[PDB]
Design a protein around this ligand. Structure first.
Ligand SMILES: [Cl-]
Ligand SMILES: [Cl-]
Ligand SMILES: [Cl-]
Ligand code: NA
Lengths: 125, 125, 125
């Protein structure tokens, strides 16, 4: 199973990657939404995307998710830095499998990943 | 996707409705279980019910869920006000998709809603 | 629905069993992984296993899960005592449906159980 982590902070991205590797996932990191779209449109399809909602100066996570979902129906779980995130109205067009705080425990993060992976297979069926 | 919120406190119901609207859901509120049963038996079927366990002076949430589940297999997620809720023995007959604290974060609430919605399609298949 | 709880502490196992009984589950407890494997290989198949990661002096929970998964594809949710558990590299070979802290609320525990039960049916389909 391949996970793409899309996150403006390399430190946060690496912190999550290390957690995921501990459970047997191979992980790629994109530090902008544009990089993520390029990777997936270039032909590398992950089994799941962990997407920072805000991102940086470029496209935000909701835009990135909506772009990727035109390429392929892949499950997206959003990462949040705030208890109540700025979610743009466009979220209505994105299929989200979950939202998790970047400060959440390993148990909460891996559970959401594992459940999203199974829910995806059930619907993609 | 249509969500029915069944909750004795209009303030709590509206607080949850606002959160759900932010993510693109259209929401209806019933302030008694009897109102909820009337709405659904009247022919309006939600994609998911968020059900207060206690409710008020009328039927409780477990009774309401059991009544609705005779009308249609709709997913119910229970709302709780207590860390360890009074759950009547009848809970054994109700198909629950989740339990969430009314004091839970947006992330926990929306994740449970999104997962219940997908798990429902997978089983209703 | 039959749940097997595999846990080194009888006190913890009983505490979880009581919570599960409150929601209508019949529960069996194994206090070693060896006992669990004997029960399942002996012909008693649970609908779900709640598995302590560490266990005691015998086989650990990851080993127990990997052994059981050779007998039957049953959903395993791991119980953890630590915020960041010692997870052996072998976890890569185990299908996990979730991880939950033994100190977690009733709501978090029952939600994970209920969702794992439905995700299992969706995939086992
Ligand atoms: Cl990058
Ligand atoms: Cl009403
Ligand atoms: Cl035993
Ligand atoms: Na089918």
């Amino acid at each position: 199973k391949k996970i793409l982590i899309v996150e403006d902070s390399k430190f946060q991205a690496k912190t999550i990657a290390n957690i995921l590797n501990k459970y047997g996932y191979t992980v790629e990191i994109a530090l902008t939404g544009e990089a993520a779209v390029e990777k997936v449109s270039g032909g590398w399809y992950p089994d799941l995307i962990l997407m920072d909602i805000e991102l940086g100066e470029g496209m935000d996570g909701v835009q990135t998710a909506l772009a990727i979902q035109q390429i392929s129906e892949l499950p997206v779980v959003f990462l949040t830095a705030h208890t109540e995130p700025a979610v743009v109205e466009k979220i209505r067009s994105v299929t989200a499998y979950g939202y998790v705080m970047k400060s959440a425990t390993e148990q909460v993060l891996i559970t959401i990943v594992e459940m999203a992976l199974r829910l995806y297979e059930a619907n993609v069926h």
